[PDB]
Amino acid sequence: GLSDGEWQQVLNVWGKVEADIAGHGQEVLIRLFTGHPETLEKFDKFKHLKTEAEMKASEDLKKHGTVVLTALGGILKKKGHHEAELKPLAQSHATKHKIPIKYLEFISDAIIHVLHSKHPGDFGADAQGAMTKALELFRNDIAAKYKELGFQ
């Protein structure tokens, strides 16, 4: 549960991502795959990537980065009212992709890392707080649907 002030910060920060959604999306996925290599194994179409240079050179990875952040952005712009948007993602990730909630924690922190990396000194304490809460909300609502499905 975020305040309107906090949602304001979230969407303000998001304007940064929207100026270059492919570049952010790319770096988030790279941060995830290199921080936590077991995550790479869940992608049959990226599992071939061995090196970060290959990751950096992958237009399909950038493409998927765009799909992911486009989805996340759509969800964030709902300011918490994202049941319709979130339900199919929870379902596909639990039932088809089999993504444990731990990996959603991983990519949450990765987003935080990328924002600091791409905008050093421009991602303030208040901004980090709001973004972090927003990603926790996202994660928590997915976790509820995972529990429903009995998915571990």
Ligand code: HEM
């Ligand atoms: C902010 C978090 C995330 C968002 C918004 C997101 C969104 C999406 C979307 C929109 C798709 C394509 C449609 C679909 O299959 O539902 C997708 C596919 C997929 N996602 Fe996620 N995702 C997130 C996190 C993750 C994480 C953390 C993992 C694994 C570590 C993951 C693994 C996958 C895989 C394996 C696919 C299918 C890829 C393919 O074969 O095309 N996702 N995701």
